[PDB]
Amino acid sequence: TWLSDFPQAWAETGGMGLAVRQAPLIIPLKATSTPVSIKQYPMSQEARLGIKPHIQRLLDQGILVPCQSPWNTPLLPVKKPGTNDYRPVQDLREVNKRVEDIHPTVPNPYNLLSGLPPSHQWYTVLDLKDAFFCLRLHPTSQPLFAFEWRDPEMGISGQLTWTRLPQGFKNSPTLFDEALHRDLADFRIQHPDLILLQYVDDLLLAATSELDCQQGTRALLQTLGNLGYRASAKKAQICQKQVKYLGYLLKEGQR
Amino acid sequence: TWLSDFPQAWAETGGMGLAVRQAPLIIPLKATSTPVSIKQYPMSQEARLGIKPHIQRLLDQGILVPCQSPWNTPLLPVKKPGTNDYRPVQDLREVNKRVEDIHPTVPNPYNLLSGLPPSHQWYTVLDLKDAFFCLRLHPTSQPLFAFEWRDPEMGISGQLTWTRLPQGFKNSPTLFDEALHRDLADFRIQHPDLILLQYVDDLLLAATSELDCQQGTRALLQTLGNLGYRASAKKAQICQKQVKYLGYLLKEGQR
DNA sequence: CTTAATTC
DNA sequence: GAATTAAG
DNA sequence: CTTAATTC
DNA sequence: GAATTAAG
């Protein structure tokens, strides 16, 4: 029952995360950038009602907050099915174009897996839930990601923005990967015999024996929870000689 | 009056040419070729009446002759203007594909002109009329170029073919250029001080003085006429310090 | 909905 | 260069 | 007229 | 991939 032994480490029981050791992120703009305010494309009531629950949850969680910003990008009504479930998707392309580029340090899955020794056959795969939202944004950079939100009948002031690293921002994957690497540096040092692969929010822990993988997993979950990250108990693959990681099926040491 | 001094050398007074020193040409087929007989696309009366005079002239000249051949390619009604003058154009692409390739020995105009010394300022440009028709085709190769010709009211048997190198055949330019080079080899040897440029049917004779260009031109015209070639008196540019050759304007030694 | 590419 | 894909 | 390429 | 060019 890994779920009961580590309440804080799982999204299911530890609540929304927040990387407490990471300083709020400051997002540098390119040298010539000036704010861009793109009007919000009219949204149907169906889309608005579909998105509303999500916006309210984020406001309650403090991930979204009201604001007045010279920046504004549009929200899009996205429903994977034909017209089923919705979810807000922000078009941050005009913001991305004005943000200074950073070196892409996230390794491609192929190269990352090359660092997996044949000696480590016991695997544990964890995926961090709402990973980007665990990283705070400095108040100075929050206005950059503002969007409009209203209600034809008693709606918020006007704009809302993110207080955490947002989805759709070009540097989120890299910034998150780099932050988690800093937070897990000690863990690696304290567990020299363990192999830990990180691909943004997807983690692979490899060990030589089931026992080591057990103790190692316990230590990783404890560490992750303490740092403020949250893993999916639902999708978790604990101490298995066969696991699915980054589209690959790890078995017998193949792939 | 160069026209009167060399009756045989001009198309205007010497009649259709025939390169008497050149053996009738044999056209080798590719190793796997078999005859192809392409049906003649129906031709309107307007097109037929327009082409008729040309066919009759060629038959009278012996350039076209009746035949029965397993080969057949279509004739096309071509009228440069909107619907004015006509002229028969044969689509020999299927024949070209079955004929063995030869090395392209005709130099491009740019490289050909590089062999024109600044010392030779006096130019004479001649263009041979119906040049390809001056070269005979061996009877064994004549059937390759057959086409259909009839008259809704008393028409020739069925097919006609060429007894001379035809227009539209992929190797005609190269074969003609090579044949003329063989026929003018002696002339070059007999006139070491003269510069002679050959580009298929377009000739440029260059000399150091007007006198040399005069005597040289007289000798070239006499030689051409004797060999059976015919130049255009109409377009002839004799002993000029400025002439148009291959799209270029030769003047002061420029171009 | 808008848009940088990639196809047909 | 009017559609098709892929994406934010 | 049919066709190998090249554009839009 | 439906037009545009170029050609035999």
Question: Cβ(B235)–Cβ(B127) under 8 Å?
Answer: yes
Whether A209 sits with its Cβ under 7 A from any strand D atom: the answer reads no
Q: How far, in Å, are A189, A207, B71 from residue A118 at the CA level?
A: 21, 10, 71
The closest nt to B74, taking CA to C1', is: E1
Q: Which H or E run contains B244?
A: strand B242-245
Question: What is the token pair recorded at A209?
Answer: 């024996």
Given a contact cutoff of 8 angstroms between Cβ atoms, the answer to whether A238 and A9 are in contact is: no
Q: Which DSSP letter does residue B82 get?
A: S
Q: After which residues is chain B broken (C to N over 2.5 A)?
A: none
Question: Å from A147 (CA) to D8 (C1')?
Answer: 14
**Is the distance from CB of A161 to CB of A67 less than 8 angstroms?**
yes
Give dist(CA A204, CA A107) in Å, integer. 14
Residue A51's contacts (CB-CB under 8 Å, 6 or more residues apart) are: A43, A75, A77, A86, A87, A88
Q: How far apart are CA A113 and CA A117, in angstroms?
A: 9
To the nearest 10°, the Cα dihedral for A142, A179, A20, A163?
10
Residue B193 CA, nucleotide D5 C1', distance (Å): 70
* B94 nearest nucleotide via C1' and CA: F8
> Is B107 within any annotated ligand binding site?
yes
Give the angle subtended at the CA of B191 by the CAs of B188 and B192, to the nearest 5°.
Answer: 85
| CA dist., res. B43 & res. A1, Å (int) | 91
Q: How far is the CA of A41 from the C1' of E6 (A)?
A: 41
Query: Is residue A55 within 8 Å of residue A147, measured between CB atoms?
Result: no
* Torsion-angle region of A57 (φ positive above 0: left; ψ -120 to 50: alpha; else: beta): alpha
Rounded to a whole number, what is the distance in angstroms from the first to the last CA of chain A? 30
Between CA B171 and C1' E6 the distance (Å) reads 25
* Nearest nucleotide by C1' position to the B78 CA atom: E1
A231 and A223 Cβ atoms separated by less than 8 Å: no
The CATH topology of domain B29-98+143-164 is: HIV Type 1 Reverse Transcriptase; Chain A, domain 1 (3.10.10)
- Residue pair A157/A146 in contact by the 8 Å Cβ criterion: no
Opening angle at CA A135, ends A134 and A139, nearest 5: 130
Is the CB of residue B41 inside 7 Å of nucleic acid strand E? Answer: yes
* Residue A154 φ/ψ region, left for φ over 0, alpha for ψ in the -120 to 50 degree band, beta for the rest: left
| Separation CA B132–CA B135 (nearest Å) | 6
In whole angstroms, how large is the CA radius of gyration of chain A? 20
Identity of the residue numbered B15: G
- Residue B70 annotated as part of some ligand binding site: no
Listed in order, the ranges of chain A carrying CATH 3.30.70.270 are 2-27+102-135+165-250
The number of residues making up chain B comes to: 255
Contact present, A126 and A232 (Cβ < 8 Å): yes
Q: Which residues pair with B99 in a beta bridge?
A: B29
The helix (run of H) or strand (run of E) holding residue B50 is: helix B45-61
Contacts with B146 (C-beta within 8 Å, 6 or more apart), sequence order: B67, B69, B71, B72, B73, B159, B160, B161
DSSP string covering B180-231 = HHHHTHHHHHH-TT-EEEEETTEEEEEESSHHHHHHHHHHHHHHHHHHT--B
The first and second tokens of residue B59, run together, are 């038959």
Q: Are A184 and A202 in contact (CB under 8 A)?
A: no
> How many whole angstroms separate alpha carbon A12 and alpha carbon A89?
24
Going by the DSSP 8-state scheme, the letter that residue B171 receives in this structure is T
> Domain B2-27+102-135+165-250: which topology?
Alpha-Beta Plaits (3.30.70)
Instruction: Answer yes or no: are the C-beta atoms of A133 and A20 closer than 8 Å.
Output: no
For CATH 3.10.10.10, the residue range(s) in chain B are 29-98+143-164
CB B197 within 8 A of CB B99: no
* Strand D atom within 7 Å of A92 CB: yes
CB B127 within 8 A of CB B221: no
Whether any strand F atom is under 7 angstroms from the Cβ of B113: the reply reads no
3-class secondary structure per residue, chain A: CHHHHCHHHEHHHHCCCCCCCCCCECCCECCCCCCCECCCCCCCHHHHHHHHHHHHHHHHHCCEEEECCCCECCEEECCCCCCCCCCEEECCHHHHCCECCCCCCCCCHHHHHCCCCCCCCEEEEEEECCCHHHCEECCCCHHHHCEECCCCCCCCCCEEEECECCCCCCCHHHHHHHHHHHHCHHHHHHCCCCEEEEECCEEEEEECCHHHHHHHHHHHHHHHHHHCCCECCCCCEEEECEEEECCEEEECCEC
Q: CB–CB of A172/A179 below 8 Å?
A: no
Report chain E positions within 7 A of protein CB atoms.
1-4
- Is the shortest CB-to-strand distance from A93 to strand D under 7 Å? yes
Check if residue A77 sits with its Cβ under 7 angstroms from strand D: no
A147 - beta bridge partners?
A160
Sign of the Cα pseudo-torsion (B43, B49, B50, B55, in order): positive
Beta strand A195-199 with A202-207 is antiparallel
Judged by C1' against the alpha carbon of A42, the nearest nucleotide is: C1
Q: Which two tokens stand for residue B200?
A: 């298929």
Q: Taking the C-alpha atoms of A227, A233, A238 and A241 in order, what is their torsion angle to the nearest 10 degrees?
A: -130
- Which method, experimentally, gave rise to this model? X-ray
The nucleotide lying nearest B76 (C-alpha to C1') is E1
Q: How do the residues of chain B divide into helix, strand and coil, expressed in percent and rounded to 5?
A: 30, 20, 45
End-to-end Cα separation, chain B, in angstroms: 30
**CB atoms < 10 A from the CB of A54, how many?**
13
Report the alpha-carbon distance of residue B94 to residue A12 in Å, rounded: 75
Residue reference for tokens 């004779």: B205
Could you tell me the two tokens for A222?
């404890």
Question: Which residue type does A250 have?
Answer: L
Euclidean distance between CA atoms A124 and A251, whole angstroms: 12
